[PDB]
Amino acid sequence: RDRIPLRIVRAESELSPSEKAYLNAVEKGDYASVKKSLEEAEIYFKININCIDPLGRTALLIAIENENLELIELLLSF
Amino acid sequence: RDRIPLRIVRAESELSPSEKAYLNAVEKGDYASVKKSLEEAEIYFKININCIDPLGRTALLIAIENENLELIELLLSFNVYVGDALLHAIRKEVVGAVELLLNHQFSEFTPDITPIILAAHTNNYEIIKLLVQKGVSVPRPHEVRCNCVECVSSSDVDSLRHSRSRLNIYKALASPSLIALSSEDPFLTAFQLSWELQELSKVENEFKSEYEELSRQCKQFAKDLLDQTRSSRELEIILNYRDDLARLKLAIKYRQKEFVAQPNCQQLLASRWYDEFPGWRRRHWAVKMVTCFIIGLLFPVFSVCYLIAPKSPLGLFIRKPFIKFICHTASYLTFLFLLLLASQDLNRQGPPPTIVEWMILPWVLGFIWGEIKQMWDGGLQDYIHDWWNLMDFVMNSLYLATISLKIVAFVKYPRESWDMWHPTLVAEALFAIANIFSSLRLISLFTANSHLGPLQISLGRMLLDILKFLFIYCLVLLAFANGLNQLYFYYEETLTCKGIRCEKQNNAFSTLFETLQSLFWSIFGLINLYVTNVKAQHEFTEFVGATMFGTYNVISLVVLLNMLIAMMNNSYQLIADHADIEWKFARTKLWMSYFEEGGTLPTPFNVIRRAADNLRRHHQYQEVMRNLVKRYVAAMIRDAKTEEGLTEENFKELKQDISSFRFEVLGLL
Ligand SMILES: CCCCCCCCCCCCCCCC(=O)OC[C@H](COP(=O)(O)O)OC(=O)CCCCCCCCCCCCCCC
Ligand SMILES: CC(C)CCC[C@@H](C)[C@H]1CC[C@H]2[C@@H]3CC=C4C[C@@H](OC(=O)CCC(=O)O)CC[C@]4(C)[C@H]3CC[C@]12C
Ligand SMILES: [Ca+2]
Ligand SMILES: [Zn+2]
């Protein structure tokens, strides 16, 4: 064997592109994008509030270390 | 010419003012200006998309290092040529590596550097995860000492490139994130990788510090991965895993001094050491030595109870590792007391005394049988890797020689009329040497104690340095002995005593052996100054010989001894910062010596379904490893963005972001 075939042994669970878009919307700090993502998360759709990153960062936590108090209030309101 | 005319020697093609303004628009964050410049670059104008700065900064590169994703997407939207810009995004640890991956000379990176190698060098978990999800492969390095056709061909073509590529591959494999993400068993991978990198540092004399740092990184990663244990059940799952403490034995085998000497590992080893002993260490010291003495005098009854009833409670009290350690210590102390009794004569044949030496022989045969048994299991490499094993092998060889010499003297043969090589005399001399070695073996028991332990470990560690300085001093002694013997061998006289071991020291430098002895004994001042005189009135020869003696004394006492003191100062300051780690590793080895069921009896008495279980153990170990890897990744990510500090790159990023916001606001109004 010539090359080491690197893979992921601890596969975990990946996320939907809509969920990843919501997570990086919380990461960027845009108020309107997170508000719209949580509007489509109000109805029972793909985007859920209880979304857990493979890194382990829930969107509330991403708001917590971003020091965005308004984003934390918006998340805790839902 | 009284002035130096400064000119540029390495000139380039430079940039046009339009291209310079375009690069400034890339730098500042004028999105409208770069869009207009690119639109003008679609038509046949001066500005080209793949322009090259004199510093080698393509517009995509300076867009990448400013962390502006919109600019990067703008250049990749117009098919700007992409060379090693993915490597620049990886080295900068920039989230635009995704856009660089999905997008369809002078290089700042070595040509053997691939994206996965550089991402592992940077130790970024997200970029490594992205590249492994996209599908990457690290080339497999060969064995440490191998001579295949490919390696010698690459060394003949380019030894520098081959060594750099091998070092880059081993730097990529040794990163904590790649082991945490792509390895089945991160602990075994870290152990074997540190072992391989240590062998590479030994083999590759150059790049030795790099491989030693990589091995230290692997060991430190293994220690941090073990540090994430939250329950004792997980610790017992990890340490007792085999593919009994099998993983702890493996970590001892791979010299993982940081995986061991961990508070959780030491807590488990202490729980297995004082087994069924509630609150042993939480007692007064006087009661501890009292009960240690009580067990010490009670060693033979426990040994007999084990030999006659292993299932008895008193036959299971010896099975405790601490109790059996006290038992073995008491046995060795009783043997040394018997040696002291033997130390406290007109017959050529010496029979054993009817009391003292006759029970001494079972300890000697027990030591011999234990040494052969310990040499049979484990191998001979670890036998020679332990200096105490060399010491007790020497002691047992001397004891066997004394036994054979006593037998020979009994079956073949006043004291003052004996030959100097009489077998009784040689037997007594070797018995005294073996007594010295047996009583010097007691320093190995200092490892159990918490006060003399680290001291004994450090003072045993600087012995290699002692041997190096002894080599240097032996060369100096040989030189001066050669010179003094050459000068003084013409004046040899033949007087009952001839040498330096009488009241009137004479013929000190007449023989080469006597010259060596006289120069050896001059360190301690036991050689007087009349040994440099001759019978004749040759004052020049006496003065030159005394000058040799003075020069040798000056070197070996003022110069060499103080250099030895200085180098023991440096060594002790270097090894006192890890004294607890080495002491706890050696104490763990001493404990796990007594943990096993075999060799429970002391030396005077020591001569007298599966697939389902393996699958369940593998699943439990994989779940524990998944939790540990998640905890380690989270901890090092939280550690990573705290202790790093602020460079000038993030200040430039702040300036570029504020300028981009300002220019977007200006574009809006
Ligand atoms: C091996 C490589 C590393 C060492 C390299 C050499 C480094 C050392 C060189 C030393 C050279 C010899 C010096 C003279 C010795 C000698 O033979 O000296 C021998 C003679 C004595 O002659 P007799 O032995 O015949 O009486 O000394 C004298 O004649 C007295 C006057 C000269 C004294 C010189 C002393 C110099 C300093 C030496 C002592 C320092 C002690 C300091 C204590 C605080
Ligand atoms: C002339 C003969 C009789 C020898 C005289 C000296 C011995 C009686 C001494 C010298 C060093 C001593 C040892 C030094 C250190 C230790 C460790 C200490 O035990 C521990 O620390 C056990 C582990 C723990 O407590 O965690 C007490 C026993 C022992 C083996 C001592 C036993 C008694 C020894 C052999
Ligand atoms: Ca031994
Ligand atoms: Zn090879």
UniProtKB/Swiss-Prot annotation, chain B:
ANK repeats lie at residues 15-46, 57-79, 82-104, 111-135. Phosphorylation modulates TRPC channel function by regulating the level of TRPC4 at the cell surface and by increasing the association with NHERF1. Residues 343-357, 408-425, 485-547 are extracellular. May be operated by a phosphatidylinositol second messenger system activated by receptor tyrosine kinases or G-protein coupled receptors. May be activated by intracellular calcium store depletion. Inhibited by xanthine-based inhibitor Pico145. One of its GO terms (biological process) is regulation of cytosolic calcium ion concentration. GO terms for molecular function: beta-catenin binding; cadherin binding; calcium channel activity; inositol 1,4,5 trisphosphate binding; store-operated calcium channel activity. It is a multi-pass membrane protein. Residues 193-230 form a coiled coil. It catalyses: Ca(2+)(in) = Ca(2+)(out). Residues 284-318 dip into the membrane without crossing it. It is found in: Cell membrane. Disulfide bonds join C497-C502. The chain crosses the membrane at residues 322-342, 358-372, 387-407, 426-448, 462-484, 548-568. GO terms for cellular component: basolateral plasma membrane; calcium channel complex; cation channel complex; caveola; cell surface; cortical cytoskeleton; plasma membrane. Homotetramer. Heterotetramer with TRPC1 and/or TRPC5. Forms a heteromeric ion channel with TRPC1, with a 1:3 TRPC1:TRPC4 stoichiometry. Interacts with TRPC4AP. Isoform alpha but not isoform beta interacts with ITPR1, ITPR2 and ITPR3. Interacts with (via PDZ-binding domain) with NHERF1. Interacts with MX1 and RNF24. Interacts (via CIRB domain) with SESTD1 (via spectrin 1 repeat). Interacts with CDH5 and CTNNB1. Interacts with SPTAN1 (via C-terminal spectrin repeats) and SPTBN5 (via C-terminus). Interacts (via protein 4.1-binding domain) with EPB41L2. Interacts with PLSCR1. The protein 4.1-binding domain (654-685) is required for binding to EPB41L2 and channel activation. The calmodulin- and inositol 1,4,5-trisphosphate receptor-binding (CIRB) domain (695-724) is sufficient for the interaction with SESTD1. Forms a receptor-activated non-selective calcium permeant cation channel. Acts as a cell-cell contact-dependent endothelial calcium entry channel. Forms a homomeric ion channel or a heteromeric ion channel with TRPC1; the heteromeric ion channel has reduced calcium permeability compared to the homomeric channel. Also permeable to monovalent ions including sodium, lithium and cesium ions. This is Short transient receptor potential channel 4. It comes from Homo sapiens. The chain holds residues 15 to 754 of 977 of the full protein.
